[PDB]
Design a protein around this ligand. Structure first.
Ligand SMILES: N#C/C=C/c1cc(Cl)cc(Oc2ccc(Cl)cc2OCCn2ccc(=O)[nH]c2=O)c1
Lengths: 538, 405
């Protein structure tokens, strides 16, 4: 007998102040009991478990489905705390790739001898006329809180020396599996796989799939990868759960499939806490999902990663706060794809969203490939220059170049830094009564032009915005506007090109049509002439 | 040579903090570094029985192409028991900020000579991540005093006293302060003699950054001096004075606003009256005085606000309570940052933090004019400092930007 290398156990404790679990054993049928007795007999014969006495107060309930099923949930609660799937697009192309799934994974790894007493379970005797048979685990139980961590740590420990000795190959480990790969000849490769299996066998780990591999929702082929086929449930009644499922599947498909739009369907899920309800859909949503079924018609594949080639990312504006991206080292062949939706906000502009998308893609790319990709962006260099130079927040994009693929991201308007000479000067104000919701908004100018419009169902902020808007409507291509509103100025200084508010959008539309606009702020109630709160106070 | 027992606060569990993604080069750097440290017993690999984790990354200091290992100890530092020793919270050297010049050194190398308490080691656990989760991360724990920990200077403090003992008695012109892994040395000497003295101190430590605190100040509020004023000029002036009235008691704008009466074009020149000139004068005089009743409270938190002025210009204010400023300043510094806002911001945050360490002996809590995602993505690339401060994000543009310009 060639001596087996001992697997050193991991010391395990319970949570502080807690004791081991004690739970009464459930009554079982005679057949179940016989099956359990047989299974536990052969298991004890294999050394996986040991018979114990009355000296162990702890008990873990058991069922038979044969197959023994032990429920550790209470022990899991009283057990201590223990310490993202690999993406196919990150995998490097290899002439040979072997998959090894170790059998009896958890049962091949011993359990800390002091913790074994807490794993104790009992098989009920027939007709409850005899004391139940007592057992405890000498190895990692299936369904125990600490099994996977201990198992993978042990596996890594065992794998370390072989990997150091074999630089010409690469070994990835996910949970219960090893995925090995090399660019060597198939004979040498298979030989080294045999050697690895021998090395694992040395520690008492038993090991035996060929391409295409079906793994974690993906499909892996030697030269390419894709996602397992997506099935979109078809029903005349769409529930909340069905929309969560559908959104999940569409998000999942969006990594390989370009152009997936989840916005409408996700918008339908706002503030819904429920399961079964029938929710209708707008023509936007229907056309969206139909176009999704259109994109899912002819399947597409992603390729693998080549470190010798530049990593490139390209972004397109999809409209309505939606953005889409592709990552590739070569034309027409994508490593992967994706999408970005704008954050929830009252106001916004294209440049900010583009920036956020760039950050997202950057982080994701650092996760997957360990580097930042070069960007191709639908924005001119001058536009970005103007934007970042004149923006109050600090902002940055990594190395990038302009690609012209309309719609292009642009700056729709720019406020002057100094008062305009020759331009009419509009002093604006608005005010509202809190209880009656009655208000007035208007302006007076230096040329004698004046307006006051009465308004119902409004507030102060809305009357200030309305005042500014009135000034924009009634003025020429170049205008100076004086406001006391910190709210309005705070909105405009954020430079939105779009808003939830219709009033703000009207203001934006007005600014777009203007050659020059200078917006100036003054304190309210300071007796600054031309600034009239008295016209709107009535 | 003997570990001093260290515990945590009353009911605080050790840090569990997610490791953020790292670039391939930084990962390799950390692998080489941690291998060398593993050979030297500084750190040791650990198993799954350790739930705790603290973030880690790699930086590059000034004038060096060699990677340094930076651990983010903020969570551990706040969860670490408040450290009081026989030193009893050694009083901050208030003479350090009054000194002509101050030089900063990295003494962290010493910390690795002192063993760490065995029970506390489990709290220093960190993870070296792998690209694309292909292999499980490499986890270590510190056997010795880790750099970046607040307990390290506190523990090594006695040794540091015994080591610096000869140097301090030799010249009693020199203020010596210690914060984290950095050692600050004040002097009234001349830069050449200062550097020779620095070399002397360094080789004095061997046997066992240039700043100028006197060249800063507390910035006064300034008002324009013009021969002719437009309506816009006066409107801005009134806005600024009205703002400053939250700061100083007797600022009065009525005679200046009196000029603005009637509705006039913004570019029209308005001659100043006698009352208005007198009012502007009295306002200047008021602004020349310091701020009434401004004190530093060691128990409270320091708040630092930063505004982007454009063209490499940044302004900042360090305060405790609103409109009482402990310090204010401007940062124009240009080194290789001209095309990058975030790098500028990062350097500014570092400089402000350093100033705050010199003056109050503690880092402030920043409010940054940047979106969270941008900062969180790019800040580690530009960070040259062994410590890290706290920060938050202001997403609403301040109206008060120009008033500090
Ligand atoms: N189930 C399962 C496997 C899942 C699985 C999971 C992961 Cl994280 C990796 C994996 O295979 C690889 C393992 C090791 C290397 Cl260096 C590259 C690989 O390239 C993968 C690319 N590839 C894929 C298949 C093939 O034949 N050739 C090839 O180059 C397989």
């Amino acid at each position: 007998m060639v001596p087996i290398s001992p697997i050193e156990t991991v010391p395990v404790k319970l949570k502080p102040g807690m004791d081991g679990p004690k739970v009464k054993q459930w009554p079982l049928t005679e057949e179940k009991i016989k099956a359990l007795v047989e299974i536990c007999t052969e298991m004890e014969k294999e050394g996986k478990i040991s018979k114990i006495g009355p000296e162990n107060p702890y008990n873990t309930p058991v069922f038979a489905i044969w197959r023994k099923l032990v429920d550790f949930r209470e022990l899991n609660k009283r057990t201590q705390d223990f310490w993202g799937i690999p993406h196919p697009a990150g995998l490097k192309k290899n002439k040979s790739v072997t998959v090894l799934d170790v059998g009896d994974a958890y049962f091949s790894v011993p359990l800390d001898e002091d913790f074994r007493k807490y794993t104790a379970f009992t098989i009920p005797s027939i007709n409850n006329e005899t004391p139940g048979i007592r057992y405890q685990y000498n190895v990692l139980p299936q369904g125990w809180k600490g099994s996977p961590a201990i198992f993978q740590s042990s596996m890594t420990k065992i794998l370390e020396p072989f990997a150091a000795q074999n630089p010409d190959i690469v070994i990835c480990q996910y949970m219960d599996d090893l995925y090995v790969g090399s660019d060597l000849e198939i004979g040498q490769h298979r030989t080294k796989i045999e050697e690895l299996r021998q090395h694992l066998l040395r520690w008492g780990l038993t090991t035996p799939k060929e391409p295409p591999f079906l793994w974690m929702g993906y499909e892996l082929h030697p030269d390419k990868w894709t996602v397992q086929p997506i099935v979109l449930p078809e029903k005349d009644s769409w529930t909340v759960n069905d929309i969560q499922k559908l959104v999940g599947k569409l998000n999942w498909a969006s990594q390989i499939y370009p152009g997936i739009k989840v916005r409408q369907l996700s918008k339908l899920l706002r503030g819904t806490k429920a399961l079964t309800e029938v929710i209708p859909l707008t023509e936007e949503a229907e056309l969206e999902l139909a176009e999704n079924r259109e994109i899912l018609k002819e399947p597409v594949h992603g390729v693998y990663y080549d470190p010798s080639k530049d990593l490139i990312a390209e972004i397109q504006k999809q409209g309505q706060g939606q953005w889409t991206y592709q990552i590739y080292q070569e034309p027409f062949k994508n490593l992967k794809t994706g999408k970005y939706a704008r954050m929830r906000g009252a106001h916004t502009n294209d440049v900010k969203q583009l920036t956020e998308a760039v950050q997202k893609i950057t982080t994701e790319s650092i996760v997957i490939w360990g580097k930042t990709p070069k960007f191709k962006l639908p924005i001119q260099k001058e536009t970005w220059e103007t934007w970042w130079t004149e923006y109050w927040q600090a902002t940055w994009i990594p190395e990038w170049e302009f690609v012209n693929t309309p719609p292009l991201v642009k700056l729709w308007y720019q406020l002057e830094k100094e008062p305009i000479v020759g331009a009419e000067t509009f002093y604006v104000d608005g005010a509202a009564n809190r209880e009656t919701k009655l208000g007035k908004a208007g302006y007076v100018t230096n040329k004698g032009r004046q307006k006051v419009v009465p308004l119902t169902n409004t507030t102060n902020q809305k009357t200030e915005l309305q005042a500014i808007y009135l000034a924009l409507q009634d003025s020429g291509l170049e205008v100076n506007i004086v406001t006391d509103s910190q709210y309005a100025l705070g909105i405009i200084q954020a430079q939105p090109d779009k808003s939830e508010s219709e009033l703000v959008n009207q203001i934006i539309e007005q600014l777009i049509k203007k050659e020059k606009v200078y917006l100036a702020w003054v304190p309210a109630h300071k007796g600054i002439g031309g600034n009239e709160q008295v016209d709107k106070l009535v | 040579i003997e570990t001093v027992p260290v515990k945590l606060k009353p009911g605080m569990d050790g840090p569990k903090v997610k490791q953020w993604p790292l670039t391939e080069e930084k990962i390799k750097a950390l692998v080489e570094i941690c291998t060398e440290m593993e050979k030297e017993g500084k750190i040791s690999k650990i198993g799954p029985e350790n739930p705790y984790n603290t973030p880690v990354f790699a930086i590059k200091k000034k004038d060096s192409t060699k990677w340094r290992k930076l651990v983010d100890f903020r969570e551990l530092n706040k969860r670490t028991q408040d450290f009081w020793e026989v030193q009893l919270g050694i009083p901050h050297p208030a003479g350090l900020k009054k000194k002509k010049s101050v030089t900063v050194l990295d003494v962290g190398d010493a910390y690795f000579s002192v063993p760490l308490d065995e029970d506390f080691r489990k709290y220093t656990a960190f993870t070296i991540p792998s690209i694309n989760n292909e292999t499980p991360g490499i986890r270590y724990q510190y056997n010795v005093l880790p750099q970046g920990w607040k307990g390290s200077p506190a523990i090594f403090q006695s040794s540091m006293t015994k080591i610096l003992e000869p140097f301090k008695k030799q010249n009693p012109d020199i203020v010596i302060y210690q914060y984290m892994d950095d050692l600050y040395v004040g002097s009234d000497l001349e830069i050449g003699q200062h550097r020779t003295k620095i070399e002397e101190l360094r080789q004095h430590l061997l046997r066992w950054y240039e700043l100028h605190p006197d060249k800063w100040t507390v910035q006064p509020i300034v008002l324009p001096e013009k021969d002719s004023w437009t309506v816009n000029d006066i409107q801005k002036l009134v806005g600024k004075l009205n703002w400053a009235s939250q700061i100083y008691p007797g600022i009065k704008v009525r005679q200046l606003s009196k000029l603005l009466r009637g509705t006039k074009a913004l570019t029209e020149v308005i001659p100043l009256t006698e009352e208005a000139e007198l009012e502007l004068a009295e306002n200047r005089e008021i602004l020349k005085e310091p701020v009434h009743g401004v004190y530093y409270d060691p128990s409270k938190d320091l708040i630092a606000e930063i505004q982007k002025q454009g063209q490499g210009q940044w302004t900042y204010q360090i305060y405790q309570e609103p409109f009482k400023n402990l310090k204010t300043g401007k940062y124009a510094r240009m080194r290789g940052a001209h095309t990058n806002d975030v790098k500028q911001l990062t350097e500014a945050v570092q400089k402000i933090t350093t100033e705050s360490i010199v003056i109050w002996g503690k880092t402030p809590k920043f409010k940054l004019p940047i979106q969270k995602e941008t900062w969180e993505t790019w800040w580690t690339e530009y960070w040259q400092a062994t410590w890290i401060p706290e920060w938050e994000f202001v997403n609403t543009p301040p109206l008060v930007k120009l008033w500090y310009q």
